[PDB]
Ligand binder design. Sequence first.
Ligand code: ADP
Ligand code: MG
Lengths: 454, 454, 584
Amino acid sequence: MIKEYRTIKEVVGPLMAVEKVSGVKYEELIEVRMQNGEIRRGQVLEVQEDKAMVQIFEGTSGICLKNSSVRFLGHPLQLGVSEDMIGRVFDGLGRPKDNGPEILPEKYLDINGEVINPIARDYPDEFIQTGISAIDHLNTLVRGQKLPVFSGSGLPHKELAAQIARQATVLDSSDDFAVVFAAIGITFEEAEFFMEDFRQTGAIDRSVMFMNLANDPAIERIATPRMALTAAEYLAYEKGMHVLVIMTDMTNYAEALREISAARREVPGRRGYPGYLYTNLATLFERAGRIRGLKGSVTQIPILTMPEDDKTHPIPDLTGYITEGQIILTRELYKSGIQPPIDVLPSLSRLKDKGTGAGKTREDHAATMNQLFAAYAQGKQAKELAVVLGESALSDIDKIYAKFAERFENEYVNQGFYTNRTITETLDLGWELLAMLPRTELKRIKDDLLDKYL
Amino acid sequence: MIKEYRTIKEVVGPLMAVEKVSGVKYEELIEVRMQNGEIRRGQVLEVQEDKAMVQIFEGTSGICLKNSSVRFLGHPLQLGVSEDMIGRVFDGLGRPKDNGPEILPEKYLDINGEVINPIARDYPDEFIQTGISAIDHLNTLVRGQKLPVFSGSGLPHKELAAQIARQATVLDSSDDFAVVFAAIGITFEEAEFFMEDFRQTGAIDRSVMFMNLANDPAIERIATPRMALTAAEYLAYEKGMHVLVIMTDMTNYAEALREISAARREVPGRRGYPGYLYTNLATLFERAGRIRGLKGSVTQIPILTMPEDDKTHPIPDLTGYITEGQIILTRELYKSGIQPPIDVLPSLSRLKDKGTGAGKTREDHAATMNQLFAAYAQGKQAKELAVVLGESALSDIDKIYAKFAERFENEYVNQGFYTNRTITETLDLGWELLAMLPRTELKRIKDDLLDKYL
Amino acid sequence: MQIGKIIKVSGPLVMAENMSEACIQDMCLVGDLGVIGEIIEMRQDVASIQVYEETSGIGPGEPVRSTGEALSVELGPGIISQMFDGIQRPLDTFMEVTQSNFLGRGVQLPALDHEKQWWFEATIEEGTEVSAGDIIGYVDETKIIQHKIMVPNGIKGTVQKIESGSFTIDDPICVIETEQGLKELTMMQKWPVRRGRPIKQKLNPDVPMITGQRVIDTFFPVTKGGAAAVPGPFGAGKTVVQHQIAKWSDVDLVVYVGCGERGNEMTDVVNEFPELIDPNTGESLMERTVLIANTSNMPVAAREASIYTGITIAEYFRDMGYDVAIMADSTSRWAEALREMSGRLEEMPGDEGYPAYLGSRLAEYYERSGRVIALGSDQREGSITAISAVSPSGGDISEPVTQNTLRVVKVFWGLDSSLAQKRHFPSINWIQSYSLYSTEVGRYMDQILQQDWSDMVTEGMRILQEEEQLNEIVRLVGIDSLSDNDRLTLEVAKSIREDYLQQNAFDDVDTFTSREKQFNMLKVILTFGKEARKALSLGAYFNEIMEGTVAVRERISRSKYIPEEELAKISSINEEIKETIQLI
Ligand SMILES: Nc1ncnc2c1ncn2[C@@H]1O[C@H](COP(=O)(O)OP(=O)(O)O)[C@@H](O)[C@H]1O
Ligand SMILES: [Mg+2]
């Protein structure tokens, strides 16, 4: 039975109040039909007795309290799913924006999804050869892992995003990634860059895209990740696909969340950001992983720009607390013409233990992982004081470290935005990337792999 | 007489609202009889018309509203004072904890007490020898003074307080301090430290304990100090005993005071603490000193841990505005093995001048203090210069003062927590330190004292 | 019975009228679904309810029924080796009943199996007078852990009838002749989680726990019945530290609480623990462990319940005379849950938005931990060691949750990002971290090892502290300006950090280090220092010592990988150190 109330009691700013209602639930989705034919989407924030406080996505501007109609849909914010979402481009609310054949959805799903039972979860251990050695060796990605990229404005994180989408795939398997891309609150020309790249590479023919622009309503920017993840969990846990999800910019998502919070007159937490920012972001990143007895997986790669290049900022900080590692891009490297400008020292992966030694490489280059970490650390401390001051403490124990950096960032870490290298190649180049440090310097447990190749 | 009310209106956290009452007075003690027979007490915070707002000491957990009654006892919260309190251990509300007999009270005294007439006051003159050089010499304690200790989490403020109460003595006939201890939200281990120390020295037989621990209700912490101070002033002004009052933790008292003010939705001051934080602490610390024509006294040594080691925090800041000086412990000195870790530079005693000199302590007391202080401040500034810049940057006169401050901390301030130095030993030790300095730079000591002593 | 009615839904806060007979802290079924909620406030007939499940799609008009009891846990045989919800719901049974891989709501499930048969062995004779805490028999729940059936609080009388046999946790197994009449007992007892289980008295935690972690057990030890906080930035090693403790500690039972963290981390525990076998006994880790999981995208209010569920279960086995270690990861999410409900209740801050009673809530939690004397005639000893992780924003430990924790606990393991960035694990900052048990632990270690271990810890710490001061000078002037004695001190300090402090948790041998191995390892490192100190005084230079000791120092750097059954290959370095340096 279709419900619609035609009398609005109170409108204070972006907030509304509807009286004499019944059977209206929390987080229920509503529609307001304007006197000029326009239809605006809304959301029930709170319900007392015969009253319902709701918020309109497009704002309450130009709304009459006697000449308007508020339809209560009897369901929360949903997404229309189907077999024919691949190859299509959608809105921030799941509406077609590519002007193709409109699809008749099989069903509608709550965009909040459901929490996977931790017992029913299947821990990720399948290695993903991203092609990028900085990632593949030191910060290894795994199917089902949530591994974000921390960048800054002006840095090539968009180039790194497209790169990973192009060349990432699972070893010794016919499985190909189904990419769900989600643009969040970005400009038209920013969104056009992705639309163009996906068409030229043909990645669009194997992808679902949810494009949310900068001048779209703030609520829609918030709904976009949940729209994309609902489509991701659908293609994975119902179609058996291995879905790769990529979102940008998460900073925009947080800023939209901050705006919405202030509109609801909620007291700001640390640095003016909501107290539930950790929780809110956790309802997105935890959607990744695998399930026992079910084919398919969900892999997330969030992307964000760190405000003022500050890592202690709430947005990347709380992201680092939730996700299983992070990939850092610095301007100091990017200024050296390094693409990708990945700094391996602040970078991390929490699921690299079972990914290594199984898919690769039986400790062949899984073992050197902790060395290149520890050696590049002293290699940087040495290069720091040896550049600004005179002769290094030792040219065999202190300036030898400097030799193993400059080229091993201009070569070992360089790679290319449209360049793809295999893991074998990476472990090939890697043994050659120790250029040039003698056998005295490699302080590892083995002498075996120090003799097989140079 | 009075009667019980079954007209409780609401239970919200630590607050209760009663309706349809009469004859209810401000700050009146109440009792809450629950349906299970359990009794909780509280006091009136605000009363108007037929309503009354009270705070519940034990809390409102498990209270059924419909089957509970409230008694109005017709008097504020009192303490049954007796000389049989000595050697007994009570809880936060002044009730037996040592499984002993019920005290047969001489009288009941309102725990808020009354303010001493400034004319009737007797100025604290009598020097107290704590045996600690950093106190006796530089920040002198006098009988009747309120001299607190500003500490931090992990710092030995317990050892310092225990040492004072164990070694404090005037140089005249009386060698008897009655110790009134008030535990406020402290842990079991911190409570056991004082218990074991008082038991081994036999101080437990001449002391009065008011113990409110961390597992005990927080709202009781508001009445606990007033309970102790009322006992303190009773034994001092009505029984003629020289009372030494030890209180910890004072920070826990402010937190409890902040819980009530938050629950009552009052307008906060700096960092959420009430606007009356200064005045409220003042009703506690002003409760000290001597009275004309009366023997015995009340000496307070409050203890608070400075949040974030920040002195500018409202709790240590407002306390400094109230008390007559403060003994500050720092982490930099505790890590250097200094016992006690007293930093004298921010330390102070506002009653040292008229408590020392000729006739009390020794004629060179004031001069040596100011000279040691200035030289110590100069040396610490020289050490900082030796940190930011090289040792070469330091002049010959800088190294001498830097070494002075180093030995001043090692041999003078650092004496141990169980060593009792006499005032003469302290002053003599002061001259042996000044001997490290050039005679020409002693610009705070006249030639009279400079020739007589080394 | 009185049936309430919802009048207000706003996030996890629900208000309902027609509940005048309702009580504070009582549990109630909320709405059509019957989701689990707790009453926290009450204004006349309307009660404010805190729901521990999702409240989306719930509105006014729906019924609310009070259970008449507080948030409680089921305590009895069949509680060990189980992974529970925030409010103690079997996640495995939840998966079986609901036939779903996801978490629904409004589904009631008993915490234990009331159908399973257990063998109850009576150990008390009839005609014996008992009270709260007294053992009447036990159940071999696991081959090691005896589940001792104790008399519940409030029961007092004589044992009239009792007999051994196969019963369930519902069947009466013992009859008590009390003053109020006759009361029959079961193997199960219920207890409110917000109320700490009664004890006779608390005791001083003076016995060091063997965590197996060298940096901890040596320099910043925690005692059985002690509390330790682990504040640090993300990726510092907080969760890894608690994992190592939960698996290597010389503790009878382990209660791990996953509070608002990752779901994969609880999955990793519940999967690997049954595969980790103790060679001495043969039992797996899971047979001494109880799991409580409420992830970050699970209901936020249930983060608080997960804490009280875990500590109460810890208290239950504590009263049996067992040592129990409870891990809370992370306690910051608990505070966030308190902040969430604080704003919903229109309350007043508070620091950083937290409720004003945050400090009290935390202080009450850690005070429930400690070494105690359990109730009973035999006066048995129990203890609860609390290991809590704190997650400061940006690593800034001056935030409320960390400060309020450091004022009630005595152990502080401050993690450092720069150490983690150097792959120096664990990332404990040896300069700023501390343990106020170190002195009492010191005399214990000296007494049980019959060695000057306390002096060894002090000396090793002095070198680390002197290193920092020397590292200030090398920053201004070159390293080559230092004396040979200072150059030696730096090299010994390097050995302390790299060979002793650095400890990989993913290495088969390095993951654990026994007390005997820690002694031999530290003695060797300090032996090289003293012998090289003598050499310098006897004319030898610094460089000549280092070059001629490459081989022996290499044995030192690998003494962490020496198998436990052959520790003699570590102590023989002491002889080699003296011999090789004497040759110089
Ligand atoms: N003791 C350790 N040994 C080896 N690696 C560690 C250790 N502690 C942490 N790490 C590494 O650091 C990362 C951080 O682990 P985790 O404990 O989850 O961080 P946090 O709990 O502080 O967020 C892990 O992925 C792990 O690889
Ligand atoms: Mg973690």
